[PDB]
From a paper:
Cellular Src kinase (c-Src) is one of the most representative members of the Src-family kinases (SFKs), a group of non­receptor tyrosine kinases that mediate responses to extracellular stimuli, phosphorylating a broad range of downstream substrates. A number of these mutations are located in the SH3 domain, which plays a critical role in enzyme function by facilitating the interaction with partner proteins and providing the formation of the closed inactive conformation of the kinase. Here, the crystal structures of three SH3-domain mutants of v-Src were determined to unveil the effects of these oncogenic mutations in this regulatory domain.
Besides the v-Src SH3 domain bearing all of the mutations, we have cloned domains with (i) only the oncogenic mutations in the RT loop (v-Src SH3 N117D-V124L; c-Src SH3 R95W-T96I, based on the sequence of the non-oncogenic variant c-Src) and (ii) those in the n-Src and distal loop (v-Src SH3 W95R-I96T; c-Src SH3 D117N-L124V). In this mutant, the n-Src loop conformation is similar to that found in chain A of c-Src SH3. Meanwhile, the distal loop conformation differs from that present in both chains of c-Src SH3. Nevertheless, in v-Src SH3 the substitution of threonine by isoleucine prevents hydrogen-bond formation by its side chain, and in this case the type I β-turn shows a hydrogen bond between the backbone atoms Ile96 O and Asp99 N. However, we could not obtain the intertwined dimer structure of v-Src SH3 bearing the oncogenic mutations in the RT loop, even with crystals obtained using the same crystallization conditions. Instead, we only obtained the monomeric form, and both mutants had only a single molecule in the asymmetric unit. The reason for the lack of intertwined dimers of these mutants can be found in the role played by Arg95 and Thr96 in the stabilization of the dimeric structure. Neither tryptophan nor isoleucine can form interactions to stabilize the intertwined dimer.
Author numbering: 83 to 140
Amino acid sequence: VTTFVALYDYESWIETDLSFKKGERLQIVNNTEGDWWLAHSLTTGQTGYIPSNYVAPS
């Protein structure tokens, strides 16, 4: 539906976060409410929380 792209690298020490590379495609699992979103990587297949301000619709 709506695909998002990472705007910056994100590496987290919280293992339930999704870490990702600038340019990687991600998707939202729930909705766009909140500053932290449950997300899924379209490249690694992993699911985890991400900061909303690190991604944009592509």
